[PDB]
Coordinates of C-alpha atoms and ligand atoms in Angstrom, one line a residue:
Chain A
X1 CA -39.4 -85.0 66.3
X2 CA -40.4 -81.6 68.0
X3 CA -42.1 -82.3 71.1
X4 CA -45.4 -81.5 73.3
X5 CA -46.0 -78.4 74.8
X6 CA -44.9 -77.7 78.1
X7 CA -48.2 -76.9 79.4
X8 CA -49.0 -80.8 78.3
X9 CA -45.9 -82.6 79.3
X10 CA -47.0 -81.2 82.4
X11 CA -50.4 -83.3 82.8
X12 CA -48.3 -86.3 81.4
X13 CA -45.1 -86.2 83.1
X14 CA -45.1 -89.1 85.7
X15 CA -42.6 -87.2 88.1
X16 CA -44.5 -84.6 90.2
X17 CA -40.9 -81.7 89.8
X18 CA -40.7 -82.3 86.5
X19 CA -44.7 -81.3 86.2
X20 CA -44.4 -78.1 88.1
X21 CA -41.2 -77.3 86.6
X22 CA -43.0 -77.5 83.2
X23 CA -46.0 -75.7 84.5
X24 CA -43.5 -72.7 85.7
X25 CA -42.2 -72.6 82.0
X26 CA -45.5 -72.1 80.9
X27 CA -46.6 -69.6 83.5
X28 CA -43.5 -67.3 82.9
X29 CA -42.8 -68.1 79.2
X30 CA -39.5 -69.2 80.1
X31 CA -37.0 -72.3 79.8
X32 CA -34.0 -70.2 81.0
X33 CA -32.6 -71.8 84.1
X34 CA -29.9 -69.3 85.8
X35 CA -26.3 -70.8 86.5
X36 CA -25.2 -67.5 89.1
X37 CA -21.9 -69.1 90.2
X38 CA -20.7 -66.7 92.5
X39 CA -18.3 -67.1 95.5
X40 CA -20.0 -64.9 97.9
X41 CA -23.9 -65.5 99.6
X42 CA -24.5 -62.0 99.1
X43 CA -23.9 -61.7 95.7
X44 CA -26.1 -65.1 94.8
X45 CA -28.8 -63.7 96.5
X46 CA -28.9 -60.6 94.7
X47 CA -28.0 -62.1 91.5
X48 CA -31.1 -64.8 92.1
X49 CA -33.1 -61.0 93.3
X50 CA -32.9 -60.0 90.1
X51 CA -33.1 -63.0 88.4
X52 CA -36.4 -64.5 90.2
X53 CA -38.6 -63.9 87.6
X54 CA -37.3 -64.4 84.4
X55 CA -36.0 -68.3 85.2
X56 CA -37.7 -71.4 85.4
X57 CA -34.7 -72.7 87.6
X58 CA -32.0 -72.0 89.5
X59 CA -29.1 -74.2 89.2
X60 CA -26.3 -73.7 91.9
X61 CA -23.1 -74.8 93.0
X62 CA -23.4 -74.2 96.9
X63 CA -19.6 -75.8 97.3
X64 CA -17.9 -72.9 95.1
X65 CA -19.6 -70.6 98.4
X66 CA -16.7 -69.0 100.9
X67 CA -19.8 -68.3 103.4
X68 CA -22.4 -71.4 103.0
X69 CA -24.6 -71.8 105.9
X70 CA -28.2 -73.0 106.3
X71 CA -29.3 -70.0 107.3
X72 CA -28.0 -67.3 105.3
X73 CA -28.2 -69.4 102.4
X74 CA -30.7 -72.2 101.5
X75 CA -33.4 -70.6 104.2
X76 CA -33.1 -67.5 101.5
X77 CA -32.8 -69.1 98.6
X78 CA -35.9 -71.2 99.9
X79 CA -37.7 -68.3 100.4
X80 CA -36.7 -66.5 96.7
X81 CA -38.0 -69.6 95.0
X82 CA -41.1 -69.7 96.5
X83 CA -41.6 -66.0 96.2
X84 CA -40.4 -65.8 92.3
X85 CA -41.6 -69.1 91.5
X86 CA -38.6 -71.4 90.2
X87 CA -37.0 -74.6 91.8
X88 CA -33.5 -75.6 93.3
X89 CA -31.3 -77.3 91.4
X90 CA -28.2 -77.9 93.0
X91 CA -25.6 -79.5 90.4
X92 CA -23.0 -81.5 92.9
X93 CA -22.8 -83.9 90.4
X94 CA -22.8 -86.8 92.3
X95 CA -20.4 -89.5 91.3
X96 CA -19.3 -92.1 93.9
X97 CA -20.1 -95.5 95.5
X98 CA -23.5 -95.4 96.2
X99 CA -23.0 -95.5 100.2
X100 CA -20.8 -92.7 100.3
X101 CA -23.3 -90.3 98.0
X102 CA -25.7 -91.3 100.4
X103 CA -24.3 -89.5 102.8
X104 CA -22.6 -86.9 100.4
X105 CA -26.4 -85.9 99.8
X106 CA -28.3 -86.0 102.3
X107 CA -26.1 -84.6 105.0
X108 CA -22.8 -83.2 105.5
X109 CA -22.4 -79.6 105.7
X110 CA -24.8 -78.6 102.7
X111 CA -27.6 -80.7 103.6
X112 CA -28.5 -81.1 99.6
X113 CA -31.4 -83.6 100.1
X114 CA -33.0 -81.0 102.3
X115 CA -34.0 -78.2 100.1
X116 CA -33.0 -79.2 96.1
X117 CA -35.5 -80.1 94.1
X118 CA -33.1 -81.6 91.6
X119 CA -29.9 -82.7 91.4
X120 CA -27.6 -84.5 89.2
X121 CA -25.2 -88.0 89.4
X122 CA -22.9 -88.9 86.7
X123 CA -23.4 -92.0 85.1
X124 CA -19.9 -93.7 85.7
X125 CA -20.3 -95.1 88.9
X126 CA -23.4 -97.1 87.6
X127 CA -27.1 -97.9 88.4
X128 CA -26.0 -97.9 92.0
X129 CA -26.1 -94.1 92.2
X130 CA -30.0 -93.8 90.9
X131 CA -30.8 -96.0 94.0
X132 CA -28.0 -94.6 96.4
X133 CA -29.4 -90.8 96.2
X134 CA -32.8 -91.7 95.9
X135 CA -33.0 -93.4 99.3
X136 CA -30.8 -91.0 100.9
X137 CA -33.8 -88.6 99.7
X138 CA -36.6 -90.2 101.1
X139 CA -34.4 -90.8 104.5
X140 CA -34.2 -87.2 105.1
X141 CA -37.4 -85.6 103.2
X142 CA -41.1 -86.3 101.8
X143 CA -40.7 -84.1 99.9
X144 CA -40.1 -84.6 95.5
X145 CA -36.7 -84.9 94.4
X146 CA -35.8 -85.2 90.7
X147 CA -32.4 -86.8 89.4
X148 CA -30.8 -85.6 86.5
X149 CA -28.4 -87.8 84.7
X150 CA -25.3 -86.3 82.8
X151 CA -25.6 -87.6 79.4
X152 CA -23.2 -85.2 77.9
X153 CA -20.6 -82.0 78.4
X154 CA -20.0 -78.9 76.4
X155 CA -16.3 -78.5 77.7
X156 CA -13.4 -79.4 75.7
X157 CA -12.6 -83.3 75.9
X158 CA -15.8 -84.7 77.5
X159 CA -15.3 -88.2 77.5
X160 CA -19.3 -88.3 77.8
X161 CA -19.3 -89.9 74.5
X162 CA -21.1 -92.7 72.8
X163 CA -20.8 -95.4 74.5
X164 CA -20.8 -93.6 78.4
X165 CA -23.5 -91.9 76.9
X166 CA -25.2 -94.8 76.4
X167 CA -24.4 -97.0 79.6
X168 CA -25.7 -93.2 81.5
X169 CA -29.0 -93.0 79.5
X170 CA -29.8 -96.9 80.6
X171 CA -29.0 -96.0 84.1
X172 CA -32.0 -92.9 83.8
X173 CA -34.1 -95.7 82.7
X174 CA -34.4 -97.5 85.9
X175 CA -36.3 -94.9 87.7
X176 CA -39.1 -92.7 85.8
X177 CA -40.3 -91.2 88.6
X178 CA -37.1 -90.4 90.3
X179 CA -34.9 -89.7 87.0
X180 CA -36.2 -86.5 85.4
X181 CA -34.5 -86.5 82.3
X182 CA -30.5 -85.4 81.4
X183 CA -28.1 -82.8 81.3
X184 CA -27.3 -83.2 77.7
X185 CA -26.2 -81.2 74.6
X186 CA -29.1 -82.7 72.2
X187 CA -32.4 -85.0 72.7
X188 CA -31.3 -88.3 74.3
X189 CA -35.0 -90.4 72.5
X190 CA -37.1 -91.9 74.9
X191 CA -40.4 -90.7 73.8
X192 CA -40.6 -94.6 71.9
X193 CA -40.2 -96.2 75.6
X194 CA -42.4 -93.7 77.2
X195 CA -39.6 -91.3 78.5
X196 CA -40.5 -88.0 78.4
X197 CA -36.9 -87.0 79.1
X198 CA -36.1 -83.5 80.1
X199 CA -32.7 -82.2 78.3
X200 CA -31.6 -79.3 80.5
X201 CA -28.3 -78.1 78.2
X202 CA -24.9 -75.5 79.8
X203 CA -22.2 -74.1 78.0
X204 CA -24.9 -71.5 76.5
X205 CA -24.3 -68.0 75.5
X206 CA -25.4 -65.6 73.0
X207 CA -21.6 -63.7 73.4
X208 CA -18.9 -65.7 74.6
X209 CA -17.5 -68.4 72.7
X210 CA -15.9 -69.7 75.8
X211 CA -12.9 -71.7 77.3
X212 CA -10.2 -70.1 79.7
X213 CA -10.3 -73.5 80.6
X214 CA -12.4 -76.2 78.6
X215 CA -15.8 -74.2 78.4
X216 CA -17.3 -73.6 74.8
X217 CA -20.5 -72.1 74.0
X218 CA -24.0 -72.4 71.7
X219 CA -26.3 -69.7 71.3
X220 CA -29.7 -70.8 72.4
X221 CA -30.7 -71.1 69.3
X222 CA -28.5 -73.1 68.4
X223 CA -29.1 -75.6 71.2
X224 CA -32.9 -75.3 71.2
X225 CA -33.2 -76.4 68.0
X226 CA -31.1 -79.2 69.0
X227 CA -34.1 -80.2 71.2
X228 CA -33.1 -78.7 74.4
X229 CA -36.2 -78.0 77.0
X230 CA -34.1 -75.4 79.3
X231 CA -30.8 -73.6 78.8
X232 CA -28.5 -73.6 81.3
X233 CA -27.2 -69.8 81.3
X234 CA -24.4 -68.6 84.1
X235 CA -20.9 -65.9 83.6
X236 CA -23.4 -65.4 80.3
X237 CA -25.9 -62.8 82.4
X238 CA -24.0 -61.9 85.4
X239 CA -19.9 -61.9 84.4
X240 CA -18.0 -59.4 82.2
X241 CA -19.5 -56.3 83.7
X242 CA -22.9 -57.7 82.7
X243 CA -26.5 -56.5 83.7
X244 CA -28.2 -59.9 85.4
X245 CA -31.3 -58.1 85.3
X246 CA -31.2 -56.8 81.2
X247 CA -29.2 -60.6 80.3
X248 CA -32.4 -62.4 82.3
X249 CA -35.1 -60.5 80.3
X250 CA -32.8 -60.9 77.2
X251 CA -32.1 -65.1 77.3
X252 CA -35.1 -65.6 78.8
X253 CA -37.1 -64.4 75.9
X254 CA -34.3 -65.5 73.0
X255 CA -34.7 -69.1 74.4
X256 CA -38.8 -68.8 74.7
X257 CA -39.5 -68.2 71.0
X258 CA -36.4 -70.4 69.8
X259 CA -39.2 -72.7 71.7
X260 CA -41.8 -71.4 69.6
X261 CA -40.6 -71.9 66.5
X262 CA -39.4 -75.5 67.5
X263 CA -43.4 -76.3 68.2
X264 CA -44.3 -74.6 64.6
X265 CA -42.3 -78.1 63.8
X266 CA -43.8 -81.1 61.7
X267 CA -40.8 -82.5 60.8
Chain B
X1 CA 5.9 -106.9 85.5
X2 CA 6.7 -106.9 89.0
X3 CA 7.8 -103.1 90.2
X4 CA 10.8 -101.3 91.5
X5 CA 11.1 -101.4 95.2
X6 CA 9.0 -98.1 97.1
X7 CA 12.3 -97.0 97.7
X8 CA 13.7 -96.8 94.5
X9 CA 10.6 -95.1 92.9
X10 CA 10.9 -92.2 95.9
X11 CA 13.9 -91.1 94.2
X12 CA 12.9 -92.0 90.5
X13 CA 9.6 -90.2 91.0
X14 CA 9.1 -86.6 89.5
X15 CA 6.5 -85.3 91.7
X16 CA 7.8 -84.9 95.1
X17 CA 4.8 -85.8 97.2
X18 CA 4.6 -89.3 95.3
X19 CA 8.4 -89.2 96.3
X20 CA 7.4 -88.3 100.0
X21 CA 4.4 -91.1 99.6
X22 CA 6.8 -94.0 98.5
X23 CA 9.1 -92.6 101.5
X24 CA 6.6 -92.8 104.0
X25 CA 5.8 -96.4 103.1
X26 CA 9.4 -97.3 103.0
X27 CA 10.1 -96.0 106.4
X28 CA 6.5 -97.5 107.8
X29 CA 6.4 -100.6 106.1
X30 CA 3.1 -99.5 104.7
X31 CA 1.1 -99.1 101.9
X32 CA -2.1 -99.5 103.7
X33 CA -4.4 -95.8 103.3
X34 CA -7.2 -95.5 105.7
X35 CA -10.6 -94.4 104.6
X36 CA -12.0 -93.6 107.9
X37 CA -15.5 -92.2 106.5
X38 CA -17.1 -91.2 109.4
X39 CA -19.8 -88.4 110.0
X40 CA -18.1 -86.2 112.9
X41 CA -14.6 -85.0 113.3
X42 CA -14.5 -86.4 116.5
X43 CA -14.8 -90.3 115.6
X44 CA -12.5 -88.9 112.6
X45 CA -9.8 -87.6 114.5
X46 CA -10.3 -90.5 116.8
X47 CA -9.6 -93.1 114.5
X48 CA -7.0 -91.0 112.7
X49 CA -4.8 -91.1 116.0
X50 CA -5.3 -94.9 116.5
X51 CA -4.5 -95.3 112.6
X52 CA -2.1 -92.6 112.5
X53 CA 1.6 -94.8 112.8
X54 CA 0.2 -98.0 110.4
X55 CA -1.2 -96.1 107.4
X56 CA 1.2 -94.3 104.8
X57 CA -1.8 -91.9 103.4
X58 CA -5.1 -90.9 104.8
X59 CA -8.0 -90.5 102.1
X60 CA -11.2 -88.0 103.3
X61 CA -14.2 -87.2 102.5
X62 CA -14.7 -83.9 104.4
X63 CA -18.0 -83.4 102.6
X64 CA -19.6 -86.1 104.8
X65 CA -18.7 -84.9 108.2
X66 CA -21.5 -83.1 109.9
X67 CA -19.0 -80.5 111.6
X68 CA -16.7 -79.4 109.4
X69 CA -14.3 -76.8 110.3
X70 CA -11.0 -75.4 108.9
X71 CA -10.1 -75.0 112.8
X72 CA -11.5 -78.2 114.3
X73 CA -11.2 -80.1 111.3
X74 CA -8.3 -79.6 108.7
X75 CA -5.6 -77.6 111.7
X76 CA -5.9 -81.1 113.8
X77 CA -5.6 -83.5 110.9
X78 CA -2.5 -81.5 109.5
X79 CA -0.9 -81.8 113.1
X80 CA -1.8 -85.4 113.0
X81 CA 0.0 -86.0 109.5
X82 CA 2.8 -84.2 110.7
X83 CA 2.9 -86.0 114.4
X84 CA 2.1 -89.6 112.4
X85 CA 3.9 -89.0 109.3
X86 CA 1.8 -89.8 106.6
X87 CA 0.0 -87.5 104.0
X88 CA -3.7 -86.3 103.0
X89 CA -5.8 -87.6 100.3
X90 CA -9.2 -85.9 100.2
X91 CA -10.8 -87.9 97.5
X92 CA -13.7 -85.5 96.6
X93 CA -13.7 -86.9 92.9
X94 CA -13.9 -83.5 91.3
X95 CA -15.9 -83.9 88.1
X96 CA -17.0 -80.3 86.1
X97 CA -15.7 -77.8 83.8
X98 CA -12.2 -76.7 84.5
X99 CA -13.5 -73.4 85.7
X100 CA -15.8 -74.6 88.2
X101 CA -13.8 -77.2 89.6
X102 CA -10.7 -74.5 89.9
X103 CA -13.3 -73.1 92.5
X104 CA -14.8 -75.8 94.6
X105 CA -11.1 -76.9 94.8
X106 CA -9.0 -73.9 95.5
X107 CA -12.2 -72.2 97.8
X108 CA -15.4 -72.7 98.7
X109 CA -15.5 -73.7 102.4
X110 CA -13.6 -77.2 102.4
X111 CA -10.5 -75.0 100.7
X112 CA -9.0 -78.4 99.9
X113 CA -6.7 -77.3 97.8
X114 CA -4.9 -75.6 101.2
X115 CA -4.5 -78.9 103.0
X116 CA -5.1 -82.0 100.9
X117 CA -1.2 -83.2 99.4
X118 CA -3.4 -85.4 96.7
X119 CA -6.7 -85.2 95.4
X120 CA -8.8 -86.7 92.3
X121 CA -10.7 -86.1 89.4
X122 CA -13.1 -88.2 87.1
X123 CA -12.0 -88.3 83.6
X124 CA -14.9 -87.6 81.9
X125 CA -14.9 -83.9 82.2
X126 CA -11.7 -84.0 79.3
X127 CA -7.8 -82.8 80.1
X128 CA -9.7 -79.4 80.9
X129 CA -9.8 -80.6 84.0
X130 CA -6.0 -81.1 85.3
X131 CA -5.6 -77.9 84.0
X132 CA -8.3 -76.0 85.8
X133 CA -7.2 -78.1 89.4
X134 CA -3.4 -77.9 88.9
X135 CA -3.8 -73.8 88.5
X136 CA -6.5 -73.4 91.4
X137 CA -3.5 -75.3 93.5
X138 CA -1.0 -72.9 92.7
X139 CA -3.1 -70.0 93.0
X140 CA -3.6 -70.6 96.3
X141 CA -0.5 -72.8 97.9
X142 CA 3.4 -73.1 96.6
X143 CA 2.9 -76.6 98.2
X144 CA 3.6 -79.5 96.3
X145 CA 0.2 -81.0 94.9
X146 CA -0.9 -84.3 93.6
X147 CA -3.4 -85.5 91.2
X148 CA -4.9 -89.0 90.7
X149 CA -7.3 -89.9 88.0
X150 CA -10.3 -92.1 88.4
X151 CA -9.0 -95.2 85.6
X152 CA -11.8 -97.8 87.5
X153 CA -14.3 -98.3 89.6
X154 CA -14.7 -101.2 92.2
X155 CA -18.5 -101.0 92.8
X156 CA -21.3 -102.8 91.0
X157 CA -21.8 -100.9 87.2
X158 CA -18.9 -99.4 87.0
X159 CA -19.2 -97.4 83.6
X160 CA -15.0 -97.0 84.2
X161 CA -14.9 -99.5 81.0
X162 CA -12.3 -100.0 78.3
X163 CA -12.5 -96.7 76.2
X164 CA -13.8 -94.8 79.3
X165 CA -10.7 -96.1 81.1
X166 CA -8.3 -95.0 78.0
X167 CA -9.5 -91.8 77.5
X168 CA -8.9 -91.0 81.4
X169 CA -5.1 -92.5 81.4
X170 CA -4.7 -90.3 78.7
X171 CA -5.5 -87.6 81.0
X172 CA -2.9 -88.5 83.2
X173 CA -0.1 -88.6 80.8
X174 CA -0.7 -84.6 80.2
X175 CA 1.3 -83.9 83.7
X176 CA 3.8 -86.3 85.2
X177 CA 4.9 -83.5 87.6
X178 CA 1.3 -83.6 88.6
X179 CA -0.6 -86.6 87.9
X180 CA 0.9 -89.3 90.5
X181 CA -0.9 -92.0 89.1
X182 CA -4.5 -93.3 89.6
X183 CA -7.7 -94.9 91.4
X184 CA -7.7 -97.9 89.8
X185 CA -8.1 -101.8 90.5
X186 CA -5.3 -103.0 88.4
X187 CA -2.0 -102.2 86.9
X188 CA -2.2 -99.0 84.3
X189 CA 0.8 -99.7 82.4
X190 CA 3.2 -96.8 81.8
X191 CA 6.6 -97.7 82.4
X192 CA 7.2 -97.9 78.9
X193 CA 6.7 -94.1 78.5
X194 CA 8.5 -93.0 81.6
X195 CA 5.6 -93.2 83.9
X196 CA 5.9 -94.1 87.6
X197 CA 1.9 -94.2 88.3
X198 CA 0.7 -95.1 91.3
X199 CA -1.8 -97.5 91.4
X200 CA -4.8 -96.7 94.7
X201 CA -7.2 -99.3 94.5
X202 CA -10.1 -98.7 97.0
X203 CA -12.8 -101.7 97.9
X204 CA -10.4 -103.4 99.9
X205 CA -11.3 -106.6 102.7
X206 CA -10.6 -109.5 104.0
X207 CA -13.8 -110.3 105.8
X208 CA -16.6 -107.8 103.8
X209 CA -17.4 -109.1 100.5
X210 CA -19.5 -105.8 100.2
X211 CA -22.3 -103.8 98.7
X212 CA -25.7 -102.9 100.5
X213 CA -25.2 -99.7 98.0
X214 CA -23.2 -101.3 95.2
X215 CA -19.5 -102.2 96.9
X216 CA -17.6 -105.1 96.2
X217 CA -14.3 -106.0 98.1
X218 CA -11.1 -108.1 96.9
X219 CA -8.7 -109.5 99.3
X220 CA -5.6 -107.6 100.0
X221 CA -3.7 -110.1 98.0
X222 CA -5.9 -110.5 95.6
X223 CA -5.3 -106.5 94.9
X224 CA -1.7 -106.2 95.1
X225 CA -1.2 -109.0 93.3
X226 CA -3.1 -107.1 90.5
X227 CA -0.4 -104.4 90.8
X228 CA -1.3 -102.8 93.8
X229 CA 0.9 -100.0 95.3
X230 CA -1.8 -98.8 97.6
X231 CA -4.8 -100.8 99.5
X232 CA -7.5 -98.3 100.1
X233 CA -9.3 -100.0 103.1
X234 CA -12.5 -98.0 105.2
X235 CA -15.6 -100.1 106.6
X236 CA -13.1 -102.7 106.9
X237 CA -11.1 -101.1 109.6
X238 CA -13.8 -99.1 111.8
X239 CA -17.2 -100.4 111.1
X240 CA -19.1 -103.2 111.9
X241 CA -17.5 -103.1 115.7
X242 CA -14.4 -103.4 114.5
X243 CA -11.2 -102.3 116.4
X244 CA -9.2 -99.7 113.8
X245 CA -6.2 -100.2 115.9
X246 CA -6.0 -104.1 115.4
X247 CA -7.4 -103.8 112.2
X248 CA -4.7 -101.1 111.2
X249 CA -2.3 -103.8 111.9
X250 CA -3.9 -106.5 110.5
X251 CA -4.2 -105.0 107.1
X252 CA -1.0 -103.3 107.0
X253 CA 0.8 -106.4 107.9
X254 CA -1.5 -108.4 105.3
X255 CA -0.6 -105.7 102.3
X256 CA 3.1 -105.1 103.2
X257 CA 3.9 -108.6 102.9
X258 CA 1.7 -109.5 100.0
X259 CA 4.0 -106.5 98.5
X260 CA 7.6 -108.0 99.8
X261 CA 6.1 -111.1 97.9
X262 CA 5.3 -109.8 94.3
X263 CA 8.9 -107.8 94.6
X264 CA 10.3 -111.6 94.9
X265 CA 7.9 -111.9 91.1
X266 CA 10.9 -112.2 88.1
X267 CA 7.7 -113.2 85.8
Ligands
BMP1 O1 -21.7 -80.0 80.3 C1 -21.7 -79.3 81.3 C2 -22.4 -79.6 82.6 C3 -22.5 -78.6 83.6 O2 -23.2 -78.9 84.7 N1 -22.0 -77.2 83.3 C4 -22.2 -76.2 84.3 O3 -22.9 -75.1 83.7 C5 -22.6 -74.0 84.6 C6 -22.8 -72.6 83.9 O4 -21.8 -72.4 82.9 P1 -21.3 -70.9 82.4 O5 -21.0 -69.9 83.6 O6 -20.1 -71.2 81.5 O7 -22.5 -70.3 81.6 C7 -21.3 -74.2 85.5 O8 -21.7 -74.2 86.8 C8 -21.0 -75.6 85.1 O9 -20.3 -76.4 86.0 C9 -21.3 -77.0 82.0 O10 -20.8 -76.0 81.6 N2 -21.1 -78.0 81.0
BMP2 O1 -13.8 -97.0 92.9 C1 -13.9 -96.5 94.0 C2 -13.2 -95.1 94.3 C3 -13.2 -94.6 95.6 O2 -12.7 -93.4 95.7 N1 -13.9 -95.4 96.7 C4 -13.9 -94.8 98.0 O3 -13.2 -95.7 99.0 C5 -13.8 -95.4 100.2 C6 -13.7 -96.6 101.2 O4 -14.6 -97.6 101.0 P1 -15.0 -98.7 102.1 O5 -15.6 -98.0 103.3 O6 -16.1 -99.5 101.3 O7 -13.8 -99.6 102.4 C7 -15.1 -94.6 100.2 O8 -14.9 -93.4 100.8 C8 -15.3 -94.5 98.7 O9 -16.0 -93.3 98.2 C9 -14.4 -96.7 96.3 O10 -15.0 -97.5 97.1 N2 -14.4 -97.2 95.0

């Protein structure tokens, strides 16, 4: 059940993010994607500062920003990713008709299609939405873009169960180019149909045990075990007085050799 | 089956901007809502002012104009809900944990939760959700707020479905001061425990039959019919060369009277 190397699933990944993503992992010795959900530009650019080389990924919520611009924001962030060596993953979380994502993503105020590398839809609003945001992609970039569907939730209630699980799954199946793989809490299969799948997993944290309102946490090793490739780490290494900088070295390397140990595997 | 008069429910209804809503139709004669989904708030504002005195509610999608601005954009639209008399719906679909939605909802640079009278949520997050929206509102307004949850879909793949659709009205029945009622394309049932929901069904038109991206349309009798309080009509007012103003008519005359006929419905 344990899977290839990253180094490998980097020659045999058919999506060209997905490739350098893994190749990252394997440069750094890291599958710790930083969540730094801040409400301030200044702050998420010191956070990511700091951050920069301990993550494989940077996964952001550019709409939860009081000073967003193109400027001051993605032209930085642009800049820290190609000086530190990670990608953008901006998790909007797509989920409408496929015309209005369209222009949800690749315009607007945010621009998203412009400078993420990845993003995410949710699988209720069906196949429509693969198609809808890919197109709206290639209208505005040549760049590669990689789709991440949302398979599952850690928050309290998800109704991301079974069955919507399922229906979300088939829709990732339609593109394997396009469709990287899933922000789930445990190995969705593929590997049978050819899918080498990507399982990027929140709701991570080696303290907290969550909530306030719905959140609840796994410790990495916990969900690496569970056959997660990256963990999805935010208020874990920058809230509650926290050190960004001491909680990037510290996940970074608790979630490498829970790796490790997973590829000592055979079942 | 067939409902209570608009007028009746205003002063049945708990939440006082479903109240206001059922009002506004009353004194209108409408139960038309205009999705003008246009890039610029110029066109928007444009179109809002020819819509303005036929439409009861006026649904947005902020995050697809190219110039938004709390000045240009949300100041102007407020005036023209006050001037017009009807409310503001932006339908941004929230969808993550209750923690980051409390943000991109109360904040960010959109600050819907300052503006908007009604809002939505997709029900796959969990109850979590309500919660963490319904706090970031009164955090940041005393202003009566209103929450609709995404039952169904109307576009192609809808994963909306049976026990997706359950565990979403079941959402809605954790606030009836706060949950108005729901997206949906039919009748959600209720009455029976004390709910008044009200039923938005979007993918509305007579003359579109749809998609390019995944739409499909049903007449306006065809929706109200299906229980209908509210015909959420867009492309089918503005685009294609259309006139809003004559369209505005046209479909708020079409849906008024296919209402005045399911109130004469005894079974
Ligand atoms: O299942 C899910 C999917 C997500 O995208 N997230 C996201 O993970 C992020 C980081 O979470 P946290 O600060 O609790 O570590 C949040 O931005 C959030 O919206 C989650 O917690 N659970
Ligand atoms: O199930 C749904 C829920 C929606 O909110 N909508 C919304 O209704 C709107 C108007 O659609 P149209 O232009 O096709 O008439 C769009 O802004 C869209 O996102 C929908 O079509 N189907």
């Amino acid at each position: 059940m344990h899977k290839a190397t990253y180094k490998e699933r980097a020659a045999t990944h058919p999506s060209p993010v997905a490739a350098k993503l893994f190749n990252i992992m394997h440069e750094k010795q890291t599958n710790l994607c930083a969540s730094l959900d801040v409400r301030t530009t200044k702050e998420l650019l010191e956070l990511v500062e700091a951050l920069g080389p301990k993550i494989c990924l940077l996964k952001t919520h550019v709409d939860i920003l009081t000073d967003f611009s193109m400027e001051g924001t993605v032209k930085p962030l642009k800049a820290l990713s190609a000086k530190y060596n990670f990608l953008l993953f901006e998790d909007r979380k797509f989920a409408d008709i496929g015309n209005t994502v369209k222009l949800q993503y690749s315009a607007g105020v945010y621009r998203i299609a412009e400078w993420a590398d990845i993003t995410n839809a949710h699988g209720v609003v069906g196949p429509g939405i693969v198609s809808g945001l890919k197109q709206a992609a290639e209208e505005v970039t040549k760049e590669p873009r990689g789709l991440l569907m949302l398979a599952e939730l850690s928050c309290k209630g998800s109704l991301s169960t079974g069955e919507y699980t399922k229906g979300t799954v088939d829709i990732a199946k339609s593109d394997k180019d396009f469709v990287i793989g899933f922000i789930a809490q445990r190995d969705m299969g593929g590997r049978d149909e050819g899918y080498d799948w990507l399982i990027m997993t929140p709701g991570v944290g080696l303290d907290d045990k969550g909530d306030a309102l719905g959140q609840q946490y796994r410790t990495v090793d916990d969900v690496v075990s569970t056959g997660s490739d990256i963990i999805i780490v935010g208020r874990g290494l920058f809230a509650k007085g926290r050190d960004a900088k001491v909680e990037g070295e510290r996940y970074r390397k608790a979630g490498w050799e829970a790796y490790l140990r997973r590829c000592g595997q055979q079942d």
